[PDB]
Design a protein around this ligand. Structure first.
Ligand SMILES: [Co+2]
Length: 258
């Protein structure tokens, strides 16, 4: 029926409805640190989120998205391996039922508790819908979460979750600053890949940060309280909404550091 992360509609079945699932540039992937090529030509990332305007948070049935106003160059990413300006449209997470799983990308086969995705689209394409149809249409910043100390800047997010518990619920969510979710270092790995949920379009330049951010056990615990189902439907906790690593194929992972 429709795709999800259960046994009957999970990642292993997606190819039946979205054949690109077995494509040449699918994500996520395992990052082999000893095979990644340091590339001295990659520039430092430029994250300008001081003018970021958050608008709302929504449970879409597969994760929760925080959405931003992308009608102007308010929150942008540039530099790194990118040409042009990429505007932030939304962020969301992937997480596990247990602390030893949850991330999509892995590092030398290590899985983290969760993975944050900051999605941006290439302004030359005019809108999100056109950007996904192009090989360089999106730039996703991925950040790993490990469980340790609480992340103060994530608390406002944790606290509104009760109000968007089931699929299709939304809540006003203004004045959230995404700078509070960045690690100290912007060192990264980069490779050409795809969206990690259907339609799995291969339109993404991934920028994966080397340094994880820490969140407390209690913080991640609140994520696991969301539901995949809509209100008044049988309860299915939103856990394990991650796609496993895909074959690298003909691709090189480049590192911005040594
Ligand atoms: Co994602």
């Amino acid at each position: 029926h429709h795709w999800g992360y259960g046994k009957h509609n999970g990642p292993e079945h997606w190819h039946k409805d979205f054949p690109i699932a077995k494509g040449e540039r699918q994500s996520p992937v395992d990052i082999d640190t000893h095979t990644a090529k340091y590339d001295p030509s990659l520039k430092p990332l430029s994250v300008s989120y001081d003018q970021a305007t958050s608008l709302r948070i929504l449970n879409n049935g597969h994760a929760f998205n925080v959405e931003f106003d992308d009608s102007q160059d308010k929150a942008v990413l540039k530099g790194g391996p990118l040409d042009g300006t990429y505007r932030l449209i939304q962020f969301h997470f992937h997480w596990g039922s247990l602390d030893g799983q949850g991330s999509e990308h892995t590092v030398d086969k290590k899985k983290y508790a969760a993975e944050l995705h900051l999605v941006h689209w290439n302004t030359k394409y005019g809108d999100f819908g056109k950007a996904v149809q192009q090989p360089d249409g999106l730039a996703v910043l991925g950040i790993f979460l490990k469980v340790g100390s609480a992340k103060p800047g994530l608390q406002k997010v944790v606290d509104v979750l009760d109000s968007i518990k089931t699929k299709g619920k939304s809540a006003d969510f203004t004045n959230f600053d995404p700078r509070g979710l960045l690690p100290e270092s912007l060192d990264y790995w980069t490779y050409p890949g795809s969206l990690t949920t259907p339609p799995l379009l291969e339109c993404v330049t991934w920028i994966v940060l080397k340094e994880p951010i820490s969140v407390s056990s209690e913080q991640v615990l609140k994520f696991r309280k969301l539901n995949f189902n809509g209100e008044g439907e049988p309860e299915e906790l939103m856990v394990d909404n991650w796609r496993p690593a895909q074959p690298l194929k003909n691709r090189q992972i480049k590192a911005s550091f040594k």
